[PDB]
Amino acid sequence: MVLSEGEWQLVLHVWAKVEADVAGHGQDIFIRLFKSHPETLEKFDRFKHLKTEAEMKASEDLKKHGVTVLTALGAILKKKGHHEAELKPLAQSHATKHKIPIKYLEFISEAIIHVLHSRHPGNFGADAQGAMNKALELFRKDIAAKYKELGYQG
């Protein structure tokens, strides 16, 4: 699949807003993910002890992790589809070291859309959400293909 320049513009326009507060968006997204799909929390040995949203918000390590994740995702989105090089190491660590099923990538994609919808309604209307979903589907599709080449079905 391929996004048009118009769709990329919608994606990058709302992403520019997210970059005004990467740490904050990172926390909201992971808290949403962990609360909505608690099973994903078990994949993080560093955070699986967190019991409440309050503890999650107060975790300095979780906040730093969120920044690392969103920074990596932002770099991929800014490539506008030409992300082969960026995807290689990400696909290897998540398939081989962390063992993250494609299903879980769908869950975090849902969390990202939910947070952008809540925080940026004016810049995240129907068309913008469709563009973001398409960009994330492309990401998940290419990651899945790499998973297979690497020997991980998940």
Which residues belong to the annotated binding site? 65, 94
For residue 106, the minimal CB distance to ligand HEM (Å) is 9
Q: Which amino acid is at 99?
A: K
Shortest distance, position 29 Cβ to ligand HEM, whole Å: 9
How far is Cα 15 from Cα 116, in angstroms, rounded to an integer?
9
What single-letter DSSP state applies at residue 42?
Answer: G
Which residues, in sequence order, are CB contacts of 116 under 8 Å at separation 6+? 14, 18, 124, 129, 132
The binding site for O2 comprises 65
The closest of 51, 24, 39 to 118, measured between CA atoms, is 24
56 contacts ligand HEM (rule: CB under 6 A)? no
Chain breaks in the chain (C to N over 2.5 A) after: none
Nearer to ligand HEM, 72 or 150 (CB): 72
Q: Is 104 in the site for ligand HEM (CB under 6 A)?
A: yes
In the bound state with ligand HEM, the residue whose beta carbon lies nearer, of 9 and 93, is 93
Which residues make up the interface to ligand HEM (CB under 6 A)? 40, 43-44, 46, 68-69, 72-73, 90, 93-94, 98, 100, 104-105, 108
